Amino acid sequence: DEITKKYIKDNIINVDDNIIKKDIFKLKNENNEITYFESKKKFDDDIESRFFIINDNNYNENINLIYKDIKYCGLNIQTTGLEVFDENIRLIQIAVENYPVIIYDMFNINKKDILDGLRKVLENKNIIKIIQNGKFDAKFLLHNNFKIENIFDTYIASKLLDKNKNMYGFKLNNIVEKYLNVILDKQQQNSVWNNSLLNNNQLFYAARDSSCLLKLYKKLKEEIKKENLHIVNDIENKCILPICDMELNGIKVDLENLQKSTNEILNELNIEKDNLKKKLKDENINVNSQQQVLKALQKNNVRDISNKLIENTSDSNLKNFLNHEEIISLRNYRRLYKLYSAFYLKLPLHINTKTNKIHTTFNQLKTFSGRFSSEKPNLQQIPRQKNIREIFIPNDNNIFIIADFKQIELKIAAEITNDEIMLKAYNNNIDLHTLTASIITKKNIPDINKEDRHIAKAINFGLIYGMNYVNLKNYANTYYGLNMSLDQCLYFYNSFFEHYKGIYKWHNQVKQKRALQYSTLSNRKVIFPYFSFTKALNYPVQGTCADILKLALVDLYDNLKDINGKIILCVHDEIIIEVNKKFQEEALKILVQSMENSASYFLKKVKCEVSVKIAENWGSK
Template sequence: MDTIYFDTETSGLDPFKHRPTLFQIKRASDKTIRIFNPGKAKLGSSKKIKGIKELLESNLVVGHNLKFDLKFLKHHFNIEPSNIFDTYIAEILISGGQKARQKGAATLETVAQEYTGIQLKKDQNVRQSFNGQELNQEQIQYAAMDVAVLPEIHAKQRQQLKELGLEKVFATEMSCIPATVWLELSGTPIYLEGAKKLEQETKEKLESSRLTVLTILKEAGYRNLDLEGMPAVNLDSPAKLLKALKAIGLDLASTDESTLSTLKHPVGKALKEYRKHQKLLNTFLEKLPKHINPATGRIHANFNQYGTLAGRFSCSKPNLQQLPRDKNIRALFKGNNGSKIITADYSQIELRILAEVSKEPKFIELFNSGGDLHKLTASLVFNKPLDQVSKEERNIAKTINFGLSYGMGGGGLQSNLKDNGIEISSDDARKYIDTFFKSYPNVKRYLEEAGQSAVKYNEIRNIAGRLIKYRPATNESERAAILREGKNNPIQSLNADILKAAMGRLYHKLRPHSAKLINVVHDELVFEVPGEHAETVSRIVKEEMEAAGREYLKSLPVIAEVTVSDVWQK
């Protein structure tokens, strides 16, 4: 097997609208860089395309940001390399995730300069000049250099990955790239007529909630009224809204969500309702239809598989991971032509990871017996038998269980519970948290040690070996942030590793079943499949997701919950 250094030039960024205009190929065993115009393949050079397909699918392919290149290869020529080394992902991994959050820190220009000392000339005019015609010397030099720098970068990154013990994590990342290509090319179906109807309904709710806020202000004594006798207040201006609230006797520092959550005056709840409808309308319902690709009639979002410090996916244009868990919103994503939507998510995966890493016996015993962890926590916190735990007490315990692994304190517990209609005092919040940690001493010890280690060494690893680095704290606020992230990042990042391992498995397993991967949301995978394949695919998805989890969690079962429906459900 040879190593192939590879890059493409294209006529644009959209594989459905644009085309590859150049392939640059260099074998490790050959000093020559070969430049090939794939556009000519449609005019009788299909034999060459078949040769390139065999070359790329039977050797190790090294490139920078390979997801981009592989989308064009798959869509236009059905070329699917799976043995790959992406120098872009490698660079972010080596940086401990730091370069995931630094714009331009992992571009080919930056990486080439760091590893080879060569300054690539990324002239925008030259980049956009590849149109399938004869190349001039400047274009040849530009194209060739993108491949010429790869061997040295590849060699040095391989060494660093080995020295840092990141080879296994990197292999997981590489297995996930073809799956991410599959995800982006699949696109997400959307019921456009339903979206328009929901948009109109939300506009009506927004107007109603606006009038509710203004009525409360008026009844509370606000005197600056408009010609219709309603308060003349721009609710979308934080400064003007704050002034209005102070005018009715509410001495607030701001109008942000956390402040409104602690406000006992009815205007706080009304404003949150107003903002909920406003966000739904402005962020999602008005924007989603604008992202429909005319070539496919689907939304093809950008999924960045190393989008955060901890290695989780991020999503943009549009952000399909931040859609509200509202059944009306999710119902807009429905299968086409009788196909089914399969939604699969890991059950309480972060709590299971916390059980594994902390070795907390009560957690492990509970998960192995199939019991209810939230009910157990409630019984311990409220000191009552399991069968006497109320629904509200279980909800409080659920918030505690999930929140404490994120470093949540008493104020956060109060705020989160209030958002769910449960009010407790600050003393009760502190008492509940203290009781939780007394009940689960291994959890307490693990979280404290993880946080302190992150602060001391400015880095931490999860049990898969993924490295997470922090910038040294320069003040107490930054130190507190590292302490908090150090507790959660090993858990959150392992969640990402498990999900990526599952995606890599499913990319291969589901190929015979015409399945499309249409969304990824932290611990959840969403597929669209022909109706006749739904039962088989749902079984495979469950099996492979759970098998991926078992690679990392050895003390307790990993459960994937799978739903088959006409729409995206959970």
């Protein structure tokens, strides 16, 4: 059929006879001298539909003038699949205001003159890029030898302006329906992208989704201004890239130690399960069942010193019912089983072939409070213990520099509440976490070890964020045999909140007024459906900690290009960088300066510090 073969030469299949094929354009010449396919069926929307196609034999040099002397532009990238490591970019879209969208067919392109102009347009810092869900596209671009410096992703602006009311969607169609008075009609049910040949309607949608971003940017730049939400948007937009680089690299694991520890812990687990079942009075029990094990404990007459019966096996509550043989074995088995199933029996299933490294997937804003989250193998969940963390190593002749913010929260709260005592203490360079570990224990500061500091962390942050005295005493008597009276905990809670008056003022003033709008130091807003004192207290401080970490990522990413270094992980408040063995001192100094000058921006009165340790293995702090 000649009808379906209308526009084959441009690598287009005329599936639908709903198209038509050149017009004079008054472009600007390099000396500042003045010098597209369409669909037959029009759309009621005012969004752009026209577009060009740039092919190997369908290139003209003067196309580059369209991007020349520009300010903002839309960009979208459609890919064959979702695995960046084993997928190739299919299409690039560029949408200039009052211009048709421009398409580079990457499969149907073999020369490099076509691409250099787009390269230069991406490079320039002064050109702001509009990309929906920028993380995906930036991942692909950095993988395929592209370098971006500026982004303005409309998902970020939408979610920040949405004030975290509904957690779902925020796709292009939902946002376009919400803010703009347009309906994109995303009826494309993921058509065949692997095939090089593409139908016309699919490309019309591909150009439409890119073109709709420009009006969205125009309107959101006004909407963000009246809300005073520009700072957080800028920080997030500039921090999109370092997440992508960190996820592109990943962290290496030595398979020999992984397999050795797997076999050893498997043998330990089997002997432990044997001992556990033998200690229990029935052999058919499936141990992992919380309800079956609850019934088993009940029929074994396991009881507390008090008149209570086993209602749950939660570790926090389980730690009280000790001094029975079976429960020590139960807890040891639970620990080993968690370590095995969560990590060791699943980590080998995640080590990518031909790379021998793990790769994760960071969630930019899925968290309520703005922290990162990992949906793929969670590198934020790998255990603390050294013997399990050593398996992570740098590449050959490389060494890690591990920097962690020293007491990042309780520095945020100090500014947000502008308390004098906390800020003076942190000028004096004293450790609040160590002091917490010492006051509720022996008074010897030098005797406080890592575990005691770790327990101090939870109690201190909880009492800052609204924990009442009954639950605090439950926690304290659980994790350390204090056996403290209720009056002792009441006195401690009051002493803390009075010796730091600003925090008590903050609690009183946020409780007295049932405000439903809360802001972070980056003006990141939220609206709660119903008041909850704990979340209300939490959100500003944690949001500011997230903002400080994101700005630190931005500054460190900018500064690290000198030494060819690369970032591999960020978890929640620390950064790991792999740098060559010759530039260790430069890497350490750069990392400390970057973290310092990121923290000193939002916090203008407390001097943040960092614990930096040059490590051969990520486990070996």
